[PDB]
């Protein structure tokens, strides 16, 4: 690795200061989000799915991809000439990727020369590579690349193409099968040094330390989640997190707010959640007994 | 608690009112101040946290939350070695007069939906043990 | 980990689906481990209590020893929200209340009156 593997083509044709967030940290714009988020629906507002899960090519809009439901475009080669910032690829963890020729591996050109591209070939990670990538382009717009979103289906017209773990609309739509890009749950995304530049509206995304296990590999993740004290958090509001959690004290797992893992409590085999502490799960159920097989005398 | 005696100032200078939180050690004794201008009702000035970082009201940082008219204009602090609470002005105005009451604050635990890391936090409470009230006069 | 279909919005539950049910007509529900049977007796939705990781009854009293006769349902929201597990409490149950053995099994076998009336 060398810094000349990072494309740096930054052109201020508009919105002067956008570039500030590349060089400086904590120089994000953070303005106009109330309007941009106007079209970002909750998972609960989508049609219920059913039937087997299929896949589709996420040929989405050219508006800024700042919403979890945005279907990412299928990946292919991206020219370095259009890239300002570093390119981050997401496996459960962020990965920095650099420039390449179509055939040669390094291109230590800073992305200034032609034929200098980002390969970006991906197939869901249990096999290799990544779920999807995010980067800032040369004029200040965030663009994404990723695995085909899941075609969930449903009875109505407002069906969902799911790039994330859409448990409440379809029970099998796990991150490991539907994930594309950094969104883990509709309200949580994988953190990285440029998250507030690429997704500048993710201000107040309280950070959590979580651990996710895919295939045979553990990833220690920084999770950024949307949570407001007092926000409703009933069972109907809880998403599946697919975590292999870190321990808090001796009795609780750290989970994303209003989410749960599928791992059972040690003593009961059941899932035990707290009503008021939003981001915890118990690893120990309270009820216990004596094994009956031990006394099945003839 | 017991408050210090009467004080008179000219505009400017500085003024300090102290409270002796006697009868108990500062295990978990919160204190704050309430102002009453002559002929007026009560104004919350602010409170201070005698404890650690776990209990800073809800935001979870400042040990000293103040009412809206006291946002940096007056300082509230506690000397933990002398069990003494203070209210201080670094510029006394002619309007800063009347009775300043010092009272023990009684926080109420956080409720509703919240995160693990803030589970020990408290919301704003009420005032239980009141001191006698001290008189401040500011004039030319 | 079971999922209730509810109102069209799916959610996590510990309530046993019928596909997990094995049973005895003598008030006992046997089931795939990992859930607790809910019985709406008539209308009341009353949750049965585990005796073993796979068996529950109406009151936890260890009762003495084909169409299904139980009216189970994915209702109750069983043990989803227990009270807080205290670090001390967990240790206490693991050291004191919890208990597998063999010497006990033998002591029990040697004391059977052999009044095997069942």
């Amino acid at each position, epitope marked *: 690795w060398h810094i000349n593997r990072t494309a740096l083509n930054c052109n201020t044709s508009l919105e002067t200061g956008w570039i500030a967030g590349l060089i400086y940290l904590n120089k994000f714009n953070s303005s106009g989000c109330p309007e941009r988020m106007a079209s970002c629906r909750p998972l609960a507002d989508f049609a219920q799915g059913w039937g087997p899960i299929s896949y589709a090519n996420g040929s989405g809009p050219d508006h800024r991809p700042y919403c979890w439901h945005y279907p990412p475009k299928p990946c292919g080669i991206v020219s370095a000439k259009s890239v300002c910032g570093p390119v981050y690829c997401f496996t459960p963890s962020p990965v920095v990727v650099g420039t390449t020729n179509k055939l040669g591996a390094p291109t230590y050109s800073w992305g200034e020369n032609e034929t200098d591209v980002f390969v970006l070939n991906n197939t869901r990670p249990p096999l290799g590579n990544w779920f999807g990538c995010t980067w800032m382009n040369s004029t200040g717009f965030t663009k994404v690349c990723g695995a085909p979103p899941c075609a969930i289906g449903g009875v109505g017209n407002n069906t969902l193409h799911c790039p994330t773990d859409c448990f409440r609309k379809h029970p099998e739509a796990t991150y490991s099968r539907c994930g594309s890009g950094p969104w883990i749950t509709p309200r949580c995304l994988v953190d990285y040094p440029y998250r507030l530049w690429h997704y500048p509206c993710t201000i107040n995304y309280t950070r959590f330390k979580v651990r996710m296990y895919i295939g045979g590999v553990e990833h220690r993740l920084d999770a950024a989640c949307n949570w407001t004290r007092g926000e409703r958090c009933d069972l109907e509001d809880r998403d599946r997190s697919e975590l292999s959690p870190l321990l808090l004290s001796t009795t609780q797992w750290q989970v994303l707010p209003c989410s749960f893992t599928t791992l059972p409590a040690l003593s009961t085999g059941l899932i035990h959640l707290h009503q008021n502490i939003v981001d915890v799960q118990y690893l120990y159920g309270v009820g216990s007994s004596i094994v009956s097989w031990a006394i099945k005398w003839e | 608690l017991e408050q210090s005696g009467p004080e008179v100032k000219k505009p400017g200078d500085s003024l300090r009112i102290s409270c002796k939180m006697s009868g108990d050690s500062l295990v978990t004794t919160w204190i704050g101040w309430v102002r009453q201008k002559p002929g007026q009702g009560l104004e919350w000035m602010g409170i201070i946290n005698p404890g650690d970082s776990s209990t800073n009201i809800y935001p979870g940082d400042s040990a000293t939350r103040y009412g809206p008219s006291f946002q940096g204009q007056v300082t509230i602090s506690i000397d933990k070695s002398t069990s003494t609470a203070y209210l201080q002005w670094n510029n006394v105005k002619a309007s800063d007069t009347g009775i300043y009451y010092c009272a023990r604050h009684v926080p109420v635990p956080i409720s509703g939906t919240f995160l693990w890391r803030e589970r020990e936090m408290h919301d704003f409470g009420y005032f239980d043990d009141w001191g006698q009230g001290t008189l401040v006069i500011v004039s030319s | 980990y079971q999922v209730r279909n509810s109102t069209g919005l799916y959610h996590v539950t510990n309530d046993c689906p019928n596909s997990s049910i094995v049973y005895e007509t003598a008030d006992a529900i046997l089931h795939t481990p990992g859930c607790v049977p809910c019985v709406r007796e008539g209308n009341a939705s009353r949750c049965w209590v585990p005796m073993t990781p796979t068996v529950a009854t109406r009151d936890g009293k260890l009762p003495a020893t084909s169409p299904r006769r139980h009216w189970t349902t994915q209702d109750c929201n069983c043990s989803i929200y227990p009270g807080h597990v205290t670090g001390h409490r967990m240790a206490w149950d693991m050291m*004191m209340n919890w208990s597998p*053995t063999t010497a006990l099994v033998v002591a029990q076998l040697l004391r059977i009156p052999q009044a095997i009336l069942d």
Partner: antibody
Amino acid sequence: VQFVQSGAEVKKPGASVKVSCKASGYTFTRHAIHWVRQAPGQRLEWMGWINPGNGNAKYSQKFQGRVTITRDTPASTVYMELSSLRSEDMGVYYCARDGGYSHDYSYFYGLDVWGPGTTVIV
Amino acid sequence: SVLTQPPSAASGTPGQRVTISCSGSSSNIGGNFVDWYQQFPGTAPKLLIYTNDQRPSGVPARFSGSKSGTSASLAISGLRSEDEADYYCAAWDDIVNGWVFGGGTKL
């Protein structure tokens, strides 16, 4: 509900000691028996505990390589052995009753019944 | 960690109330519960607080109180000379999986 210790011991450094508590006035099937040490003028110190009947026992890491405890169930007696004395072990050793966990699982029952305390001199 | 309580009580005359404080971390004194015990020289200690819903039989109302967070205390209302015992703060420690006692406060 009395716990009865027997004797006291004086041993030179490096020597082992043994104390036991017989107990009566209760069933000794529904509570734990704890061991607590107190050097003269010092803090009560936790050593470990045993589950009557099961024989299950846990130890403080401080004594994990130094002590062991057992129970002679029909004798209603808990025994504790210290493999050797190291001067710092001088003091009074007590056994105590860890009551149920309030039964209704409210505030727990702490150690309400303590034996007299045996004296161990290094 | 280790529970911390003062080495001595404020003391005073009969009719006076004193408070014996105790503090620690969230790994022991916080959460769980904090037992309080009374010990006179020459004997075994006995319970005062956080047992039997904080009021054990045989113990007068004289000995009472509790605190939130990682604090605890024992208030002794009326310093009868018969109460000049050492008092101990005890709690379950979730790091070491055992009991922790404080230094002992002398009244």
